[PDB]
Enzyme design. Structure first.
Site, mmCIF file in Angstrom:
data_model
loop_
_atom_site.group_PDB
_atom_site.id
_atom_site.type_symbol
_atom_site.label_atom_id
_atom_site.label_comp_id
_atom_site.label_asym_id
_atom_site.label_seq_id
_atom_site.Cartn_x
_atom_site.Cartn_y
_atom_site.Cartn_z
ATOM 1 N N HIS A 44 71.092 98.745 22.611
ATOM 2 C CA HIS A 44 71.856 98.816 23.838
ATOM 3 C C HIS A 44 73.059 97.871 23.868
ATOM 4 O O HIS A 44 73.951 98.018 24.707
ATOM 5 C CB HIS A 44 70.932 98.601 25.055
ATOM 6 C CG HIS A 44 70.555 97.164 25.319
ATOM 7 N ND1 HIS A 44 69.361 96.620 24.899
ATOM 8 C CD2 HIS A 44 71.165 96.206 26.060
ATOM 9 C CE1 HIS A 44 69.253 95.386 25.363
ATOM 10 N NE2 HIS A 44 70.331 95.112 26.070
ATOM 11 N N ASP A 93 64.783 100.087 20.671
ATOM 12 C CA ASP A 93 65.989 99.316 20.965
ATOM 13 C C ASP A 93 66.191 98.286 19.865
ATOM 14 O O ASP A 93 65.940 97.098 20.045
ATOM 15 C CB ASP A 93 65.857 98.609 22.316
ATOM 16 C CG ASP A 93 67.188 98.129 22.867
ATOM 17 O OD1 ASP A 93 68.241 98.412 22.270
ATOM 18 O OD2 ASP A 93 67.173 97.454 23.903
ATOM 19 N N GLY A 189 72.628 88.749 28.712
ATOM 20 C CA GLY A 189 73.329 87.973 27.708
ATOM 21 C C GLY A 189 72.346 87.448 26.681
ATOM 22 O O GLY A 189 72.722 86.960 25.603
ATOM 23 N N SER A 191 69.957 89.431 25.721
ATOM 24 C CA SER A 191 69.698 90.673 24.989
ATOM 25 C C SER A 191 70.094 90.610 23.515
ATOM 26 O O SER A 191 71.137 90.062 23.162
ATOM 27 C CB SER A 191 70.424 91.841 25.668
ATOM 28 O OG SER A 191 69.644 92.415 26.706
ATOM 29 N N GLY A 192 69.244 91.166 22.654
ATOM 30 C CA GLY A 192 69.551 91.213 21.233
ATOM 31 C C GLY A 192 69.079 89.957 20.538
ATOM 32 O O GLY A 192 69.020 89.913 19.312
#
Length: 241
Positions: A44, A93, A189, A191-192
């Site tokens: 995403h 994801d 922020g 995320s990942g």
């Protein structure tokens, strides 16, 4: 990371800042360095973004200071082909960012160590979430990398806590984290980014995917923060790295 504390320089050497160019470069998501030319992130985060408008920064601790840092633009990336496939929220994801240049694995810069197999679900392990995501209800981003100790809950507990939330579909390829105080958790922020768990040394056992947010755009730490279970993608990671 809401309710977190200050991380130390070179504490999470594989931690990366993945920036997005929107006129000016600014931190978008987190990521982890797999190798000299590879980084692990969330689908995403790169979904709909041209690779030229993306780059990562290694060896960073304070966003305002890029001293002794290394920046690599991203040549391209590989999103999981089954991303979004199914009922589970943000299914598969995961993505690989392919760097346009090699990064030298320095002192404060090291490749992430993934789990060895999918024999362990880590439920009950007190792990650490790190990142430059939101720390509160405002839109500011922290300058210094944040970190927070939170334990991994079982998938039965994770599905059960989401039963009252519409659109929250949990499955086994998800790894959840929940603070019993309902004070710390991930936010935008983050995320990942990595879920660092002690497992014969700190291993990146998760990738920040999603959290529960109020109808006012705030993140809710009383709900689990959902990560992508990395031990369940070891083969995919290996084929696309």
């Amino acid at each position: 990371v809401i309710g977190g504390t200050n991380a130390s320089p070179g504490e999470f050497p594989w931690q990366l800042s993945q920036q997005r160019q929107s006129g000016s470069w600014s931190h978008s998501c987190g990521a982890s360095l797999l190798s000299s030319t590879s980084a692990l992130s969330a689908s995403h985060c790169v979904d709909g973004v041209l690779p030229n408008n993306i780059r990562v920064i290694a060896g960073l601790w304070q966003q305002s200071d890029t001293s002794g840092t290394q920046t690599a633009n991203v040549d391209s990336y590989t999103m999981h082909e089954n991303y979004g496939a199914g009922t589970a929220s943000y299914s598969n994801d995961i993505a690989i960012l392919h760097l346009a240049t090699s990064i030298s694995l320095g002192g404060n810069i090291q490749a992430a160590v993934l789990p060895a197999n999918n024999n362990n679900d880590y439920a009950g392990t007190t792990c650490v979430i790190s990142g430059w995501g939101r720390t509160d209800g405002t839109n500011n981003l922290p300058d210094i990398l944040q970190k927070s100790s939170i334990p991994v809950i079982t998938t039965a507990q994770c599905t059960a806590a989401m039963v009252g939330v519409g659109g929250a579909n949990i499955w086994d390829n998800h790894i959840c984290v929940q603070d019993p105080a309902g004070n710390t958790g991930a936010c935008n922020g983050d995320s990942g980014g990595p879920l660092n768990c002690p497992d014969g040394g700190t291993r990146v056992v998760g990738v920040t995917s999603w959290v529960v947010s109020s109808g006012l755009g705030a993140c809710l730490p009383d709900y689990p923060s959902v990560y992508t279970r990395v031990s369940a993608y070891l083969g995919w990671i290996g084929d696309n790295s």
